[PDB]
Amino acid sequence: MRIDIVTIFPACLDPLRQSLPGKAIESGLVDLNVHDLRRWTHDVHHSVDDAPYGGGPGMVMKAPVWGEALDEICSSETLLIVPTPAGVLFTQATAQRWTTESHLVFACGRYEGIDQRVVQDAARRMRVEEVSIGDYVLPGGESAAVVMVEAVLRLLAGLLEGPSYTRPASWRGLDVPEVLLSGDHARIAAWRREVSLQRTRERRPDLS
Amino acid sequence: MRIDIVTIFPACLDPLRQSLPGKAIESGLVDLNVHDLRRWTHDVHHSVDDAPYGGGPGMVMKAPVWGEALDEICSSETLLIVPTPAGVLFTQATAQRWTTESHLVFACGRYEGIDQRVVQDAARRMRVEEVSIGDYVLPGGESAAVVMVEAVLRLLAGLLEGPSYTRPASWRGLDVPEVLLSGDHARIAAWRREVSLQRTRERRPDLS
Ligand SMILES: CCCCCCCCNCc1ccc(CNC(=O)c2csc3nc[nH]c(=O)c23)cc1
Ligand SMILES: CCCCCCCCNCc1ccc(CNC(=O)c2csc3nc[nH]c(=O)c23)cc1
């Protein structure tokens, strides 16, 4: 898998060179490239942002600079991912589906986002996905791209989860559930499913 | 605000020293400390993980090492945050509420998570929150803590969003909507609300 990430903050993708992602990249499974969006600008001040049409707060990322960067990095086979608070929610099924892709391109935005015509122009030649990592507001899309790449890379390398325990059996007056010390595989699996259904009902009832 | 993050991978929190978070930290608003969990171990091999009771895949983070680290860093006023796939979903309202906290402690887990008795023992003296950033699986909680800190720090420093546009008015045969060039504040706001309702219905109908 070839992964390209375009951003005004390349240093923010540095966690992808460590731990699980780092291993996958070093072992030739993944070819990861981080690019500074300013390398495609032609002006003296390397500007990437301009004032929005119709007024509004902040700045908007210019379509011609994104258009040059994507023209160079993308092909007809590329899946262009645009992290955005207005996208569809990223899920485990999306992470699983993206392991089947040959080339993923993450266009990380800052300011108030990227001019909408970049994605419309990209959609004429390649598949585009506008994706949110959740119902909260981030300063940019770099940390969302890290999250998305980590979910995809761990699937390449290889109800809510219930509680887990390890030694000691008693710690600060707190005992490991007696069932986990039974040796009985069947009642262990039954208890884990039971506490997993219970935690799901309390914390995420939408999942049952 | 004082923020402490405990992890076996301190380098994975390096994006918090750049951009928006970096500014907030440097300007004395936020006091950020990253700690290596191995600094509280006493064994020769600095082990943080052990085999799970009741069998299962992988390893579980030991309660005594987490117990020592939290005993030193936390007080009765501390809000202990445990990033976990089994937690409640992180939202904008949570990010807003956490700006009111004096001391936030993020206990980042690796392997299959942290022994459950750590949070039960912590809940005897401090407020604890078990939080997920979304319905996808990550290799650990460092990138989820980055996401959570970035959402909180941007609120300190200061329906789905509709499309945005900037110069030029025509780019690759794609024109900026005529309404955004009208000068008419009222029909601009009406059009933006309209395209925002439309995008919400298509991509996130659960929000209306
Ligand atoms: C005083 C300055 C003006 C501030 C006005 C802020 C109003 C909100 N503008 C919308 C906006 C918010 C955040 C972003 C950056 N977010 C991401 O790139 C992002 C990418 S994926 C994602 N997932 C969840 N939430 C997210 O914010 C994101 C882009 C546009
Ligand atoms: C062959 C090795 C065995 C693999 C078995 C994996 C089965 C799943 N175990 C549960 C588990 C998954 C991920 C984690 C690490 N995740 C986070 O720390 C995390 C912290 S916040 C969060 N939000 C969404 N998703 C997340 O995964 C997280 C911890 C326990």
Side-chain angles (χ1 to χ4, degrees), chain A residues 57-58 83-85 109 111-113 131-141 144, chain B residues 154 161:
Chain A
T84 160
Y111 309 103
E112 298 296 291
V131 175
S132 177
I133 55 152
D135 294 336
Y136 38 87
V137 187
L138 298 170
Chain B
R154 71 170 293 275
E161 285 287 331

mmCIF file with all atom_site columns, all heavy atoms in Angstrom, chain A residues 57-58 83-85 109 111-113 131-141 144, chain B residues 154 161, ligand 1:
data_model
loop_
_atom_site.group_PDB
_atom_site.id
_atom_site.type_symbol
_atom_site.label_atom_id
_atom_site.label_alt_id
_atom_site.label_comp_id
_atom_site.label_asym_id
_atom_site.label_entity_id
_atom_site.label_seq_id
_atom_site.pdbx_PDB_ins_code
_atom_site.Cartn_x
_atom_site.Cartn_y
_atom_site.Cartn_z
_atom_site.occupancy
_atom_site.B_iso_or_equiv
_atom_site.pdbx_formal_charge
_atom_site.auth_seq_id
_atom_site.auth_comp_id
_atom_site.auth_asym_id
_atom_site.auth_atom_id
_atom_site.pdbx_PDB_model_num
ATOM   1   N N   . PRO A 1 57  ? -16.102 33.651 8.975  1.00 0.00 ? 57  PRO A N   1
ATOM   2   C CA  . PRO A 1 57  ? -14.907 33.680 9.825  1.00 0.00 ? 57  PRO A CA  1
ATOM   3   C C   . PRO A 1 57  ? -13.732 32.993 9.139  1.00 0.00 ? 57  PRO A C   1
ATOM   4   O O   . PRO A 1 57  ? -13.929 32.126 8.285  1.00 0.00 ? 57  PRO A O   1
ATOM   5   C CB  . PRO A 1 57  ? -15.355 32.927 11.078 1.00 0.00 ? 57  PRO A CB  1
ATOM   6   C CG  . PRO A 1 57  ? -16.389 31.948 10.585 1.00 0.00 ? 57  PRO A CG  1
ATOM   7   C CD  . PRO A 1 57  ? -16.992 32.518 9.317  1.00 0.00 ? 57  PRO A CD  1
ATOM   8   N N   . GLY A 1 58  ? -12.534 33.406 9.517  1.00 0.00 ? 58  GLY A N   1
ATOM   9   C CA  . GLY A 1 58  ? -11.278 32.836 9.054  1.00 0.00 ? 58  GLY A CA  1
ATOM   10  C C   . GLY A 1 58  ? -10.975 32.842 7.571  1.00 0.00 ? 58  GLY A C   1
ATOM   11  O O   . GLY A 1 58  ? -11.397 33.729 6.821  1.00 0.00 ? 58  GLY A O   1
ATOM   12  N N   . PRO A 1 83  ? -10.209 14.468 5.118  1.00 0.00 ? 83  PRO A N   1
ATOM   13  C CA  . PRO A 1 83  ? -10.735 14.527 6.494  1.00 0.00 ? 83  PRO A CA  1
ATOM   14  C C   . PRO A 1 83  ? -11.471 15.862 6.652  1.00 0.00 ? 83  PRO A C   1
ATOM   15  O O   . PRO A 1 83  ? -10.935 16.915 6.288  1.00 0.00 ? 83  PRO A O   1
ATOM   16  C CB  . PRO A 1 83  ? -9.487  14.447 7.356  1.00 0.00 ? 83  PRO A CB  1
ATOM   17  C CG  . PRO A 1 83  ? -8.387  13.892 6.403  1.00 0.00 ? 83  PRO A CG  1
ATOM   18  C CD  . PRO A 1 83  ? -8.743  14.562 5.113  1.00 0.00 ? 83  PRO A CD  1
ATOM   19  N N   . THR A 1 84  ? -12.722 15.811 7.113  1.00 0.00 ? 84  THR A N   1
ATOM   20  C CA  . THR A 1 84  ? -13.544 17.017 7.263  1.00 0.00 ? 84  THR A CA  1
ATOM   21  C C   . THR A 1 84  ? -14.610 16.826 8.317  1.00 0.00 ? 84  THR A C   1
ATOM   22  O O   . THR A 1 84  ? -15.188 15.750 8.384  1.00 0.00 ? 84  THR A O   1
ATOM   23  C CB  . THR A 1 84  ? -14.163 17.510 5.889  1.00 0.00 ? 84  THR A CB  1
ATOM   24  O OG1 . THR A 1 84  ? -15.274 18.341 6.160  1.00 0.00 ? 84  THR A OG1 1
ATOM   25  C CG2 . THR A 1 84  ? -14.646 16.394 4.998  1.00 0.00 ? 84  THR A CG2 1
ATOM   26  N N   . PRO A 1 85  ? -14.952 17.871 9.096  1.00 0.00 ? 85  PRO A N   1
ATOM   27  C CA  . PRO A 1 85  ? -16.056 17.721 10.068 1.00 0.00 ? 85  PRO A CA  1
ATOM   28  C C   . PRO A 1 85  ? -17.431 17.536 9.393  1.00 0.00 ? 85  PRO A C   1
ATOM   29  O O   . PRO A 1 85  ? -18.389 17.155 10.044 1.00 0.00 ? 85  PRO A O   1
ATOM   30  C CB  . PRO A 1 85  ? -15.984 19.023 10.873 1.00 0.00 ? 85  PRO A CB  1
ATOM   31  C CG  . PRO A 1 85  ? -15.426 20.032 9.897  1.00 0.00 ? 85  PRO A CG  1
ATOM   32  C CD  . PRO A 1 85  ? -14.393 19.244 9.116  1.00 0.00 ? 85  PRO A CD  1
ATOM   33  N N   . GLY A 1 109 ? -6.686  19.490 5.750  1.00 0.00 ? 109 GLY A N   1
ATOM   34  C CA  . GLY A 1 109 ? -7.001  20.905 5.754  1.00 0.00 ? 109 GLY A CA  1
ATOM   35  C C   . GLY A 1 109 ? -6.736  21.587 7.080  1.00 0.00 ? 109 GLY A C   1
ATOM   36  O O   . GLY A 1 109 ? -6.727  20.945 8.131  1.00 0.00 ? 109 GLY A O   1
ATOM   37  N N   . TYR A 1 111 ? -7.280  26.033 8.728  1.00 0.00 ? 111 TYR A N   1
ATOM   38  C CA  . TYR A 1 111 ? -8.159  27.215 8.594  1.00 0.00 ? 111 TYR A CA  1
ATOM   39  C C   . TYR A 1 111 ? -9.646  26.775 8.665  1.00 0.00 ? 111 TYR A C   1
ATOM   40  O O   . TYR A 1 111 ? -10.002 26.047 9.588  1.00 0.00 ? 111 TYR A O   1
ATOM   41  C CB  . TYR A 1 111 ? -7.816  28.048 7.330  1.00 0.00 ? 111 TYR A CB  1
ATOM   42  C CG  . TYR A 1 111 ? -6.347  28.390 7.207  1.00 0.00 ? 111 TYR A CG  1
ATOM   43  C CD1 . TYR A 1 111 ? -5.522  27.700 6.320  1.00 0.00 ? 111 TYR A CD1 1
ATOM   44  C CD2 . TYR A 1 111 ? -5.777  29.404 7.976  1.00 0.00 ? 111 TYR A CD2 1
ATOM   45  C CE1 . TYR A 1 111 ? -4.161  27.989 6.223  1.00 0.00 ? 111 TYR A CE1 1
ATOM   46  C CE2 . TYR A 1 111 ? -4.421  29.715 7.872  1.00 0.00 ? 111 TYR A CE2 1
ATOM   47  C CZ  . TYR A 1 111 ? -3.616  29.004 6.993  1.00 0.00 ? 111 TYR A CZ  1
ATOM   48  O OH  . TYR A 1 111 ? -2.277  29.292 6.888  1.00 0.00 ? 111 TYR A OH  1
ATOM   49  N N   . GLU A 1 112 ? -10.492 27.151 7.685  1.00 0.00 ? 112 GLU A N   1
ATOM   50  C CA  . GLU A 1 112 ? -11.896 26.726 7.690  1.00 0.00 ? 112 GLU A CA  1
ATOM   51  C C   . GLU A 1 112 ? -12.161 25.567 6.717  1.00 0.00 ? 112 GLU A C   1
ATOM   52  O O   . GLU A 1 112 ? -13.296 25.132 6.550  1.00 0.00 ? 112 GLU A O   1
ATOM   53  C CB  . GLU A 1 112 ? -12.850 27.916 7.456  1.00 0.00 ? 112 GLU A CB  1
ATOM   54  C CG  . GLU A 1 112 ? -12.761 28.987 8.535  1.00 0.00 ? 112 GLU A CG  1
ATOM   55  C CD  . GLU A 1 112 ? -13.165 28.559 9.932  1.00 0.00 ? 112 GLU A CD  1
ATOM   56  O OE1 . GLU A 1 112 ? -14.372 28.304 10.140 1.00 0.00 ? 112 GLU A OE1 1
ATOM   57  O OE2 . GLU A 1 112 ? -12.286 28.509 10.823 1.00 0.00 ? 112 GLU A OE2 1
ATOM   58  N N   . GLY A 1 113 ? -11.095 25.045 6.127  1.00 0.00 ? 113 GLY A N   1
ATOM   59  C CA  . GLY A 1 113 ? -11.174 23.918 5.214  1.00 0.00 ? 113 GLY A CA  1
ATOM   60  C C   . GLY A 1 113 ? -10.649 24.257 3.845  1.00 0.00 ? 113 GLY A C   1
ATOM   61  O O   . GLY A 1 113 ? -10.040 25.306 3.648  1.00 0.00 ? 113 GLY A O   1
ATOM   62  N N   . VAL A 1 131 ? -14.543 12.438 5.024  1.00 0.00 ? 131 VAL A N   1
ATOM   63  C CA  . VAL A 1 131 ? -14.677 11.655 6.252  1.00 0.00 ? 131 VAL A CA  1
ATOM   64  C C   . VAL A 1 131 ? -14.432 12.444 7.554  1.00 0.00 ? 131 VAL A C   1
ATOM   65  O O   . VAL A 1 131 ? -13.438 13.145 7.704  1.00 0.00 ? 131 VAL A O   1
ATOM   66  C CB  . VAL A 1 131 ? -13.741 10.405 6.140  1.00 0.00 ? 131 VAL A CB  1
ATOM   67  C CG1 . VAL A 1 131 ? -13.703 9.566  7.416  1.00 0.00 ? 131 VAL A CG1 1
ATOM   68  C CG2 . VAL A 1 131 ? -14.110 9.518  4.939  1.00 0.00 ? 131 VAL A CG2 1
ATOM   69  N N   . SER A 1 132 ? -15.318 12.232 8.527  1.00 0.00 ? 132 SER A N   1
ATOM   70  C CA  . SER A 1 132 ? -15.183 12.786 9.862  1.00 0.00 ? 132 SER A CA  1
ATOM   71  C C   . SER A 1 132 ? -14.798 11.634 10.786 1.00 0.00 ? 132 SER A C   1
ATOM   72  O O   . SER A 1 132 ? -15.270 10.522 10.574 1.00 0.00 ? 132 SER A O   1
ATOM   73  C CB  . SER A 1 132 ? -16.502 13.393 10.331 1.00 0.00 ? 132 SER A CB  1
ATOM   74  O OG  . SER A 1 132 ? -16.323 13.858 11.657 1.00 0.00 ? 132 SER A OG  1
ATOM   75  N N   . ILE A 1 133 ? -13.982 11.898 11.818 1.00 0.00 ? 133 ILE A N   1
ATOM   76  C CA  . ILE A 1 133 ? -13.622 10.864 12.797 1.00 0.00 ? 133 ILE A CA  1
ATOM   77  C C   . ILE A 1 133 ? -14.578 10.908 13.996 1.00 0.00 ? 133 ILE A C   1
ATOM   78  O O   . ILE A 1 133 ? -14.569 9.995  14.819 1.00 0.00 ? 133 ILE A O   1
ATOM   79  C CB  . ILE A 1 133 ? -12.127 10.822 13.213 1.00 0.00 ? 133 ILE A CB  1
ATOM   80  C CG1 . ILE A 1 133 ? -11.632 12.195 13.748 1.00 0.00 ? 133 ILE A CG1 1
ATOM   81  C CG2 . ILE A 1 133 ? -11.255 10.281 12.092 1.00 0.00 ? 133 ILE A CG2 1
ATOM   82  C CD1 . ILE A 1 133 ? -10.495 12.129 14.756 1.00 0.00 ? 133 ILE A CD1 1
ATOM   83  N N   . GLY A 1 134 ? -15.437 11.920 14.056 1.00 0.00 ? 134 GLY A N   1
ATOM   84  C CA  . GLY A 1 134 ? -16.397 12.022 15.150 1.00 0.00 ? 134 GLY A CA  1
ATOM   85  C C   . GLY A 1 134 ? -17.004 13.383 15.361 1.00 0.00 ? 134 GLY A C   1
ATOM   86  O O   . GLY A 1 134 ? -16.500 14.375 14.841 1.00 0.00 ? 134 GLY A O   1
ATOM   87  N N   . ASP A 1 135 ? -18.040 13.446 16.213 1.00 0.00 ? 135 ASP A N   1
ATOM   88  C CA  . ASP A 1 135 ? -18.809 14.665 16.504 1.00 0.00 ? 135 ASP A CA  1
ATOM   89  C C   . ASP A 1 135 ? -18.139 15.624 17.506 1.00 0.00 ? 135 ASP A C   1
ATOM   90  O O   . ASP A 1 135 ? -18.677 15.917 18.574 1.00 0.00 ? 135 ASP A O   1
ATOM   91  C CB  . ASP A 1 135 ? -20.231 14.265 16.946 1.00 0.00 ? 135 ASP A CB  1
ATOM   92  C CG  . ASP A 1 135 ? -21.000 13.614 15.805 1.00 0.00 ? 135 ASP A CG  1
ATOM   93  O OD1 . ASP A 1 135 ? -20.657 13.880 14.631 1.00 0.00 ? 135 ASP A OD1 1
ATOM   94  O OD2 . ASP A 1 135 ? -21.957 12.862 16.084 1.00 0.00 ? 135 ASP A OD2 1
ATOM   95  N N   . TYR A 1 136 ? -16.967 16.134 17.126 1.00 0.00 ? 136 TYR A N   1
ATOM   96  C CA  . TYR A 1 136 ? -16.154 17.090 17.878 1.00 0.00 ? 136 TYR A CA  1
ATOM   97  C C   . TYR A 1 136 ? -15.362 17.891 16.872 1.00 0.00 ? 136 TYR A C   1
ATOM   98  O O   . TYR A 1 136 ? -15.179 17.427 15.756 1.00 0.00 ? 136 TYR A O   1
ATOM   99  C CB  . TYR A 1 136 ? -15.225 16.389 18.883 1.00 0.00 ? 136 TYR A CB  1
ATOM   100 C CG  . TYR A 1 136 ? -14.643 15.091 18.380 1.00 0.00 ? 136 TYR A CG  1
ATOM   101 C CD1 . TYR A 1 136 ? -13.459 15.073 17.646 1.00 0.00 ? 136 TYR A CD1 1
ATOM   102 C CD2 . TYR A 1 136 ? -15.213 13.869 18.729 1.00 0.00 ? 136 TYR A CD2 1
ATOM   103 C CE1 . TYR A 1 136 ? -12.929 13.875 17.159 1.00 0.00 ? 136 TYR A CE1 1
ATOM   104 C CE2 . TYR A 1 136 ? -14.680 12.662 18.268 1.00 0.00 ? 136 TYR A CE2 1
ATOM   105 C CZ  . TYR A 1 136 ? -13.531 12.672 17.489 1.00 0.00 ? 136 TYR A CZ  1
ATOM   106 O OH  . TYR A 1 136 ? -12.998 11.486 17.047 1.00 0.00 ? 136 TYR A OH  1
ATOM   107 N N   . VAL A 1 137 ? -14.925 19.091 17.249 1.00 0.00 ? 137 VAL A N   1
ATOM   108 C CA  . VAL A 1 137 ? -14.200 20.010 16.364 1.00 0.00 ? 137 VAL A CA  1
ATOM   109 C C   . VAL A 1 137 ? -12.677 20.033 16.646 1.00 0.00 ? 137 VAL A C   1
ATOM   110 O O   . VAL A 1 137 ? -12.243 20.259 17.783 1.00 0.00 ? 137 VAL A O   1
ATOM   111 C CB  . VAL A 1 137 ? -14.824 21.433 16.403 1.00 0.00 ? 137 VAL A CB  1
ATOM   112 C CG1 . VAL A 1 137 ? -14.182 22.340 15.350 1.00 0.00 ? 137 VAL A CG1 1
ATOM   113 C CG2 . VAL A 1 137 ? -16.337 21.373 16.196 1.00 0.00 ? 137 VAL A CG2 1
ATOM   114 N N   . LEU A 1 138 ? -11.890 19.787 15.591 1.00 0.00 ? 138 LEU A N   1
ATOM   115 C CA  . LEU A 1 138 ? -10.445 19.741 15.631 1.00 0.00 ? 138 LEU A CA  1
ATOM   116 C C   . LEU A 1 138 ? -9.856  20.967 14.925 1.00 0.00 ? 138 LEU A C   1
ATOM   117 O O   . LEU A 1 138 ? -10.518 21.536 14.041 1.00 0.00 ? 138 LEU A O   1
ATOM   118 C CB  . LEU A 1 138 ? -9.963  18.452 14.931 1.00 0.00 ? 138 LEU A CB  1
ATOM   119 C CG  . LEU A 1 138 ? -10.402 17.123 15.551 1.00 0.00 ? 138 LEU A CG  1
ATOM   120 C CD1 . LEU A 1 138 ? -10.056 15.975 14.635 1.00 0.00 ? 138 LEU A CD1 1
ATOM   121 C CD2 . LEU A 1 138 ? -9.779  16.924 16.904 1.00 0.00 ? 138 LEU A CD2 1
ATOM   122 N N   . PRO A 1 139 ? -8.612  21.378 15.255 1.00 0.00 ? 139 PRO A N   1
ATOM   123 C CA  . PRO A 1 139 ? -8.027  22.530 14.550 1.00 0.00 ? 139 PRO A CA  1
ATOM   124 C C   . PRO A 1 139 ? -7.614  22.236 13.101 1.00 0.00 ? 139 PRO A C   1
ATOM   125 O O   . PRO A 1 139 ? -7.508  23.160 12.306 1.00 0.00 ? 139 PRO A O   1
ATOM   126 C CB  . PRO A 1 139 ? -6.860  22.941 15.444 1.00 0.00 ? 139 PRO A CB  1
ATOM   127 C CG  . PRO A 1 139 ? -6.453  21.679 16.119 1.00 0.00 ? 139 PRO A CG  1
ATOM   128 C CD  . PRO A 1 139 ? -7.686  20.838 16.273 1.00 0.00 ? 139 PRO A CD  1
ATOM   129 N N   . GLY A 1 140 ? -7.432  20.967 12.759 1.00 0.00 ? 140 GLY A N   1
ATOM   130 C CA  . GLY A 1 140 ? -7.066  20.552 11.409 1.00 0.00 ? 140 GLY A CA  1
ATOM   131 C C   . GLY A 1 140 ? -7.212  19.055 11.230 1.00 0.00 ? 140 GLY A C   1
ATOM   132 O O   . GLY A 1 140 ? -7.551  18.352 12.186 1.00 0.00 ? 140 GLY A O   1
ATOM   133 N N   . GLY A 1 141 ? -6.914  18.561 10.028 1.00 0.00 ? 141 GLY A N   1
ATOM   134 C CA  . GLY A 1 141 ? -7.113  17.150 9.738  1.00 0.00 ? 141 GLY A CA  1
ATOM   135 C C   . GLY A 1 141 ? -5.954  16.187 9.900  1.00 0.00 ? 141 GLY A C   1
ATOM   136 O O   . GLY A 1 141 ? -6.107  15.019 9.521  1.00 0.00 ? 141 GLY A O   1
ATOM   137 N N   . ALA A 1 144 ? -6.581  13.578 12.702 1.00 0.00 ? 144 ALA A N   1
ATOM   138 C CA  . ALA A 1 144 ? -7.662  12.709 12.232 1.00 0.00 ? 144 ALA A CA  1
ATOM   139 C C   . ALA A 1 144 ? -7.044  11.715 11.223 1.00 0.00 ? 144 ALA A C   1
ATOM   140 O O   . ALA A 1 144 ? -7.391  10.532 11.240 1.00 0.00 ? 144 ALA A O   1
ATOM   141 C CB  . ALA A 1 144 ? -8.753  13.538 11.567 1.00 0.00 ? 144 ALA A CB  1
ATOM   142 N N   . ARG B 1 154 ? -8.153  24.090 21.612 1.00 0.00 ? 154 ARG B N   1
ATOM   143 C CA  . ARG B 1 154 ? -8.681  25.092 20.680 1.00 0.00 ? 154 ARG B CA  1
ATOM   144 C C   . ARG B 1 154 ? -9.827  25.881 21.269 1.00 0.00 ? 154 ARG B C   1
ATOM   145 O O   . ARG B 1 154 ? -10.047 27.011 20.833 1.00 0.00 ? 154 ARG B O   1
ATOM   146 C CB  . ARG B 1 154 ? -9.043  24.500 19.302 1.00 0.00 ? 154 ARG B CB  1
ATOM   147 C CG  . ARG B 1 154 ? -10.262 23.604 19.325 1.00 0.00 ? 154 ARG B CG  1
ATOM   148 C CD  . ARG B 1 154 ? -10.726 23.237 17.937 1.00 0.00 ? 154 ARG B CD  1
ATOM   149 N NE  . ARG B 1 154 ? -11.264 24.362 17.159 1.00 0.00 ? 154 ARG B NE  1
ATOM   150 C CZ  . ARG B 1 154 ? -12.518 24.807 17.204 1.00 0.00 ? 154 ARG B CZ  1
ATOM   151 N NH1 . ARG B 1 154 ? -13.389 24.291 18.071 1.00 0.00 ? 154 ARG B NH1 1
ATOM   152 N NH2 . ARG B 1 154 ? -12.909 25.779 16.392 1.00 0.00 ? 154 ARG B NH2 1
ATOM   153 N N   . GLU B 1 161 ? -21.213 21.616 8.643  1.00 0.00 ? 161 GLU B N   1
ATOM   154 C CA  . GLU B 1 161 ? -20.689 22.804 7.972  1.00 0.00 ? 161 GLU B CA  1
ATOM   155 C C   . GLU B 1 161 ? -20.904 22.666 6.469  1.00 0.00 ? 161 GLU B C   1
ATOM   156 O O   . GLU B 1 161 ? -20.805 21.555 5.930  1.00 0.00 ? 161 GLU B O   1
ATOM   157 C CB  . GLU B 1 161 ? -19.201 22.975 8.283  1.00 0.00 ? 161 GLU B CB  1
ATOM   158 C CG  . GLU B 1 161 ? -18.935 23.497 9.688  1.00 0.00 ? 161 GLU B CG  1
ATOM   159 C CD  . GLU B 1 161 ? -19.258 24.963 9.925  1.00 0.00 ? 161 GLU B CD  1
ATOM   160 O OE1 . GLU B 1 161 ? -19.181 25.759 8.959  1.00 0.00 ? 161 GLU B OE1 1
ATOM   161 O OE2 . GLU B 1 161 ? -19.593 25.314 11.081 1.00 0.00 ? 161 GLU B OE2 1
HETATM 162 C C1  . LIG C 2 .   ? -12.020 32.875 15.282 1.00 0.00 ? 1   LIG C C1  1
HETATM 163 C C2  . LIG C 2 .   ? -11.658 31.896 14.155 1.00 0.00 ? 1   LIG C C2  1
HETATM 164 C C3  . LIG C 2 .   ? -12.926 31.417 13.438 1.00 0.00 ? 1   LIG C C3  1
HETATM 165 C C4  . LIG C 2 .   ? -13.328 30.030 13.954 1.00 0.00 ? 1   LIG C C4  1
HETATM 166 C C5  . LIG C 2 .   ? -14.581 29.537 13.228 1.00 0.00 ? 1   LIG C C5  1
HETATM 167 C C6  . LIG C 2 .   ? -14.729 28.028 13.457 1.00 0.00 ? 1   LIG C C6  1
HETATM 168 C C7  . LIG C 2 .   ? -16.091 27.564 12.925 1.00 0.00 ? 1   LIG C C7  1
HETATM 169 C C8  . LIG C 2 .   ? -16.005 26.105 12.460 1.00 0.00 ? 1   LIG C C8  1
HETATM 170 N N1  . LIG C 2 .   ? -15.475 25.994 11.092 1.00 0.00 ? 1   LIG C N1  1
HETATM 171 C C9  . LIG C 2 .   ? -15.585 24.636 10.536 1.00 0.00 ? 1   LIG C C9  1
HETATM 172 C C10 . LIG C 2 .   ? -14.408 23.864 10.619 1.00 0.00 ? 1   LIG C C10 1
HETATM 173 C C11 . LIG C 2 .   ? -14.031 23.298 11.844 1.00 0.00 ? 1   LIG C C11 1
HETATM 174 C C12 . LIG C 2 .   ? -12.895 22.486 11.920 1.00 0.00 ? 1   LIG C C12 1
HETATM 175 C C13 . LIG C 2 .   ? -12.140 22.193 10.778 1.00 0.00 ? 1   LIG C C13 1
HETATM 176 C C14 . LIG C 2 .   ? -11.024 21.348 10.881 1.00 0.00 ? 1   LIG C C14 1
HETATM 177 N N2  . LIG C 2 .   ? -11.435 19.930 11.116 1.00 0.00 ? 1   LIG C N2  1
HETATM 178 C C15 . LIG C 2 .   ? -10.939 18.865 10.440 1.00 0.00 ? 1   LIG C C15 1
HETATM 179 O O1  . LIG C 2 .   ? -10.133 19.055 9.525  1.00 0.00 ? 1   LIG C O1  1
HETATM 180 C C16 . LIG C 2 .   ? -11.409 17.583 10.688 1.00 0.00 ? 1   LIG C C16 1
HETATM 181 C C17 . LIG C 2 .   ? -10.972 16.616 9.850  1.00 0.00 ? 1   LIG C C17 1
HETATM 182 S S1  . LIG C 2 .   ? -11.657 15.114 10.227 1.00 0.00 ? 1   LIG C S1  1
HETATM 183 C C18 . LIG C 2 .   ? -12.516 15.739 11.475 1.00 0.00 ? 1   LIG C C18 1
HETATM 184 N N3  . LIG C 2 .   ? -13.298 15.017 12.296 1.00 0.00 ? 1   LIG C N3  1
HETATM 185 C C19 . LIG C 2 .   ? -14.014 15.601 13.324 1.00 0.00 ? 1   LIG C C19 1
HETATM 186 N N4  . LIG C 2 .   ? -13.863 16.892 13.470 1.00 0.00 ? 1   LIG C N4  1
HETATM 187 C C20 . LIG C 2 .   ? -12.990 17.656 12.682 1.00 0.00 ? 1   LIG C C20 1
HETATM 188 O O2  . LIG C 2 .   ? -12.935 18.848 13.016 1.00 0.00 ? 1   LIG C O2  1
HETATM 189 C C21 . LIG C 2 .   ? -12.302 17.092 11.632 1.00 0.00 ? 1   LIG C C21 1
HETATM 190 C C22 . LIG C 2 .   ? -12.537 22.718 9.539  1.00 0.00 ? 1   LIG C C22 1
HETATM 191 C C23 . LIG C 2 .   ? -13.667 23.550 9.464  1.00 0.00 ? 1   LIG C C23 1
#
